[PDB]
Each structure stands twice: as C-alpha cells, then as structure tokens.
Amino acid sequence: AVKEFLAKAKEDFLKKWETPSQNTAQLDQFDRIKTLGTGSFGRVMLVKHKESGNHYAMKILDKQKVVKLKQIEHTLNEKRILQAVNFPFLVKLEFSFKDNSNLYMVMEYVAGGEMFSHLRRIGRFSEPHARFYAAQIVLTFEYLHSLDLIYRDLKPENLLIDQQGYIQVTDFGFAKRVKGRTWTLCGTPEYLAPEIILSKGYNKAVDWWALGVLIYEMAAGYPPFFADQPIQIYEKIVSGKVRFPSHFSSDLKDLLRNLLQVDLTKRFGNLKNGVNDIKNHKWFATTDWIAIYQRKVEAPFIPKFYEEEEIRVSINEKCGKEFTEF
Amino acid sequence: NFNPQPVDTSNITIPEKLEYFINKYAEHSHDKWSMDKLANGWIYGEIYSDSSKIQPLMKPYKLLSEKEKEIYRWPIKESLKTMLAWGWRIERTREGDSMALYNRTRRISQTSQVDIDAAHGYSPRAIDMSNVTLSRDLHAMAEMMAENYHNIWAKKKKLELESKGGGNHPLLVPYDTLTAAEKAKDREKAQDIFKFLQISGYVVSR
Ligand SMILES: Nc1ncnc2c1ncn2[C@@H]1O[C@H](COP(=O)(O)OP(=O)(O)NP(=O)(O)O)[C@@H](O)[C@H]1O
Numbered sequence: 001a002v003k004e005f006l007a008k009a010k011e012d013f014l015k016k017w018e019t020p021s022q023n024t025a026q027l028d029q030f031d032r033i034k035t036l037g038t039g040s041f042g043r044v045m046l047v048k049h050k051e052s053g054n055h056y057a058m059k060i061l062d063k064q065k066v067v068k069l070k071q072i073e074h075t076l077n078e079k080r081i082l083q084a085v086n087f088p089f090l091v092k093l094e095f096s097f098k099d100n101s102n103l104y105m106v107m108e109y110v111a112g113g114e115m116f117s118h119l120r121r122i123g124r125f126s127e128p129h130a131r132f133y134a135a136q137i138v139l140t141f142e143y144l145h146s147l148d149l150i151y152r153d154l155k156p157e158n159l160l161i162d163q164q165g166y167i168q169v170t171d172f173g174f175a176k177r178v179k180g181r182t183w184t185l186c187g188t189p190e191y192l193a194p195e196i197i198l199s200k201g202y203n204k205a206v207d208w209w210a211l212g213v214l215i216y217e218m219a220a221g222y223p224p225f226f227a228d229q230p231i232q233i234y235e236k237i238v239s240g241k242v243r244f245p246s247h248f249s250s251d252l253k254d255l256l257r258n259l260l261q262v263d264l265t266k267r268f269g270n271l272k273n274g275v276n277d278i279k280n281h282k283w284f285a286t287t288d289w290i291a292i293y294q295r296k297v298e299a300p301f302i303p304k305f306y307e308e309e310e311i312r313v314s315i316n317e318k319c320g321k322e323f324t325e326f
Numbered sequence: 327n328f329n330p331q332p333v334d335t336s337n338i339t340i341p342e343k344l345e346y347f348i349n350k351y352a353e354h355s356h357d358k359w360s361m362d363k364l365a366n367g368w369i370y371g372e373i374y375s376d377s378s379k380i381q382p383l384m385k386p387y388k389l390l391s392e393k394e395k396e397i398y399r400w401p402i403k404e405s406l407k408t409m410l411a412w413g414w415r416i417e418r419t420r421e422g423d424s425m426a427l428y429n430r431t432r433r434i435s436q437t438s439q440v441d442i443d444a445a446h447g448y449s450p451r452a453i454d455m456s457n458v459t460l461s462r463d464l465h466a467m468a469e470m471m472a473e474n475y476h477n478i479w480a481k482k483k484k485l486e487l488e489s490k491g492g493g494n495h496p497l498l499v500p501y502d503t504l505t506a507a508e509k510a511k512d513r514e515k516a517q518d519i520f521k522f523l524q525i526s527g528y529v530v531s532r
C-alpha cells in the first residue's frame with residue numbers, strides 16, 4: 001500500500017536520473033505567442049504546443065550568457081533534476097531541448113504569484129496560512145530526501161504560488177543527490193544551517209533547519225538571523241541564539257526550537273522518527289497531511305489572473321562542450 | 327558656591343528583568359572598544375604587552391571574566407540606577423527593532439568561504455547608532471543624565487581636593503557653563519545609553 005508507491009516513485013526517479021531524457025521536443029513544434037518575462041539567461045515565452053494546443057512557458061537560455069554568468073553546472077543540474085522528479089509541489093518540466101545557440105526548458109504554464117513578493121506585500125502570514133504553506137514544504141522534503149536529494153536552497157524567492165494557491169519549488173540549481181555527507185558551501189546567508197558555516201560537512205538535516213527559517217520568516221515577516229553584513233549573520237546562526245516575536249504561539253515556538261536546533265543530532269526531521277516528529281508536532285495538529293498532498297485543502301490566497309523580438313539560432317554550434325549532457 | 331549633589335543611588339535595586347539589557351549593552355560596548363583598538367592598530371595576544379600593541383581582552387565578551395565584564399557593567403548599572411532614583415520608568419515596549427532594520431530586498435544565493443572563515447574568529451561590528459534619533463523629550467532627559475555624570479565627577483573631585491587641602495580644577499563649575507567640547511563626553515555617554523535603550527525596544531519615561 002504505502003510501501004508500493006515510495007518504492008515505485010524512487011524506481012521511476014532513478015531510471016530518469018541515471019539516463020536523462022534529451023531533445024524531447026523541437027522549436028518548430030510550438031507557436032510563439034509572446035514574451036512573459038526576461039530572465040538572467042534570456043526570455044520566457046508563452047508558447048502553444050501545435051499538436052496538443054496546450055500553453056507552456058518556454059524558458060530560453062542563451063548558452064553563451066549561462067557560461068559568462070558561471071551558471072553552467074547549476075543549469076545542467078536543475079534540468080537533470082526536473083526531468084526525473086514528480087511531486088505536486090515541484091514545477092513540471094514538460095519538454096527540454098537545445099540548439100546551436102540556446103537551451104529550452106518548456107515548463108507547465110503557471111499564472112500565479114511569487115511567495116517572496118506576496119509575503120513582503122502582506123508583511124507576515126498568520127500561523128494558519130504559514131502552516132498551510134509549511135505542510136507543502138514538509139511533504140516536498142520528505143519526497144526529495146526519499147530520493148537522497150538535499151535541496152539546500154529553501155527561501156521564499158524559490159517558491160511560486162500556483163493557480164490554486166499551492167506552492168511549487170522553482171529552482172534546483174544546488175540540489176544534490178548524496179548518501180551521507182557533502183561539503184559545498186551554497187545557499188543564501190540568512191538560510192545557512194550552522195553545520196554549513198562550520199565547514200566540516202553536512203547532510204539532509206540542513207533542509208529541516210531551512211524549514212525552521214522559512215516558517216519563522218513567514219510568521220514574523222523577517223527571518224531569525226539578519227545583519228548588515230554576512231559575517232555577523234553567520235555568527236548569530238552558529239551562536240545558537242534566536243528570539244521569537246511575542247505574537248508567536250507556544251506551539252510554534254516549540255516546533256521552531258526543535259527545527260532551529262544548532263545540534264543537527266537533535267534536530268526534528270533528523271531523528272529516528274524522521275519526518276513524523278514534524279508531522280505529529282502540536283503546531284501541525286489541524287493539518288490533514290493526505291488532503292494537503294491531494295491538494296484538497298482550500299488555499300488562503302488565489303493569485304489574480306510591438307514588444308516581440310525574434311529568436312535567432314546561430315548556424316554554428318555555441319558551447320557544445322559545456323552543454324553536451326543537456 | 328558650586329555644590330554638585332548627584333542623586334544618591336546607594337539604595338537603588340535594579341529590577342532583575344533589566345539584566346537582559348545590561349548584558350546586551352555591555353557586549354555592544356566591549357565590541358565597540360575592540361573595533362576602536364583594531365582601528366588604532368592593536369591586535370589580540372594571549373599574553374599582554376604594551377610593546378608592539380597586543381591586547382588579550384580583544385576577544386569575544388563571553389570569554390571575559392566577571393572582573394573584565396564589570397568594566398562595562400558597572401557604569402551601565404550606575405546609569406540605570408540614576409534614572410530609577412529620579413522615579414523614571416524603564417519598560418521594554420517591543421523586541422530589538424528587528425523588522426524596521428531588516429533589509430527586505432530579494433536575496434541571491436551567493437556565499438563566500440572568506441566570510442564563513444572570518445565568522446570563526448572575533449570579528450566585532452557594533453551597530454552604528456549615528457542614524458538613531460531621540461525625541462525632543464528624550465534629548466532633554468539625555469541632557470539631564472549628561473549633567474548628572476558631570477556632577478558625579480565634580481562631587482568626587484571636590485571631595486578629593488577638600489581631603490588633600492590642595493588642588494584646583496577649572497571644570498569644577500556648573501555643567502551648563504561648560505563649552506560644547508567640554509560637555510561632549512558626558513553628552514555622548516548619555517545619548518549612547520538612550521539610543522541603545524531605544525534600539526533594544528525600551529522606552530524611558532518620566
Ligand atoms: N511557468 C511559468 N509560467 C508563467 N510565467 C512564467 C513561468 N516561469 C517564468 N515565468 C515568467 O518569466 C519571468 C522571468 O523568468 P524566471 O524564470 O523567473 O527568471 P530567473 O532567470 O529564474 N531569475 P531569478 O529567479 O531571480 O534567478 C517570471 O517573472 C514570470 O513572469
């Protein structure tokens with residue numbers, strides 16, 4: 001029953017992870033409607049797949065710009081992850097391909113909002129609203145960890161709010177498949193777990209720390225460790241000092257004491273009972289975990305629903321070496 | 327005729343709840359001290375030597391002994407006792423001004439091992455309270471504290487000279503007859519504690 005899917009989810013992921021799909025569509029299969037946005041590496045275009053009639057958000061990444069901005073490994077890693085994972089709170093890569101000039105990531109079209117701008121505009125979320133979004137991160141990390149993936153870049157900036165007001169994780173540049181320990185310094189200063197700063201190796205428990213930072217930031221409107229310069233943030237994080245706003249519930253303070261636990265060996269999510277120490281915490285008492293997974297809970301916020309330049313694809317292959325695996 | 331009589335604080339008990347503030351301000355003050363020693367070309371050193379400018383107190387506040395902490399704690403407590411002896415109220419209104427000072431700009435996932443390594447050492451950067459403003463009433467209260475610091479110094483000095491039968495100091499005069507430059511030290515000490523109370527979420531009222 002429960003054993004059936006967790007095994008099968010992992011087998012489907014591993015097959016795709018070990019042999020990634022490449023060039024699963026091509027440019028002439030899409031009608032180009034308009035530019036939705038401009039990214040670091042190029043544009044995002046609204047496209048219509050000619051055969052299905054479905055709309056997609058086609059991210060176009062200029063290979064030369066990815067190389068210049070030193071985002072090669074991050075771009076390859078994100079695409080390799082996105083073509084292998086399948087979970088309700090992870091963005092859906094529908095097709096990928098490359099040509100002489102560009103990489104193309106054809107994403108499910110989401111006319112939503114960004115968690116970052118919504119949270120900053122609202123200021124702070126109520127505990128019930130924060131809990132709704134938090135539950136989705138708990139299930140998403142349970143899923144990623146079951147595949148030995150460490151996410152290691154949680155922050156509001158990496159979460160969209162979709163058309164039904166659920167969140168989707170949008171960025172996988174840093175995520176790593178690893179059994180046990182890894183060392184790479186990455187993330188954003190305010191979300192670094194103490195064991196990252198201590199620079200002696202860390203494991204998937206850094207994700208549960210980051211969940212603590214996100215829950216605090218959602219409920220307070222500011223994160224637990226901040227300062228005008230990073231060095232002082234790193235000091236506060238390893239210092240093991242945190243102060244909760246007087247409006248935090250006692251249940252929220254208890255959860256965050258156990259997630260913002262400097263000793264990864266005592267941190268919730270990293271003990272014998274794993275994710276259940278979090279799911280069965282009093283702060284989540286009202287949470288229907290299966291109904292969140294099935295997206296049956298009513299979300300608290302539903303987002304509100306001659307510019308064209310042509311795509312020129314060079315005659316000559318650019319950066320063939322760097323993007324061979326894409 | 328000059329007869330400085332600073333309020334007697336000998337029988338004032340600081341409420342235990344202000345311990346939080348005393349510790350926080352003492353640590354800030356030590357970090358400010360260390361920054362100023364680094365900027366005048368002093369450096370930490372296990373064993374003290376005035377030669378080559380080595381200072382073993384240029385370490386984190388938590389490592390200091392009781393005695394070394396008292397260098398900061400004693401004047402802070404003396405300052406609070408004066409305010410309480412005047413019947414002023416010191417109430418913690420909020421937390422340490424978290425939101426207002428937090429930079430709410432979108433964050434990039436950029437980290438440096440150089441910063442990470444620096445965070446293992448003692449890397450003092452006390453808050454610059456230069457931007458922090460006092461109300462008209464809190465400025466007047468700070469000026470009264472400045473005056474009382476002068477009167478504490480003046481009464482101690484006067485009793486010293488009276489005990490000896492000799493000595494004369496030109497600053498043994500009423501506080502307001504002093505020049506700005508002569509007031510500046512007492513003004514900055516008074517303003518420092520009022521500014522630090524404010525950023526720490528405290529309101530002083532009378
Ligand atoms: N799936 C999508 N559906 C609809 N619009 C999208 C989608 N993905 C991206 N967009 C639009 O494209 C814009 C810019 O693309 P985006 O992928 O956010 O850039 P980026 O290069 O990841 N920048 P950053 O996240 O700051 O590092 C967004 O602000 C949206 O308006």
Ligand SMILES: [Cl-]
Pocket residue numbers: 412532
């Ligand atoms: Cl008064």
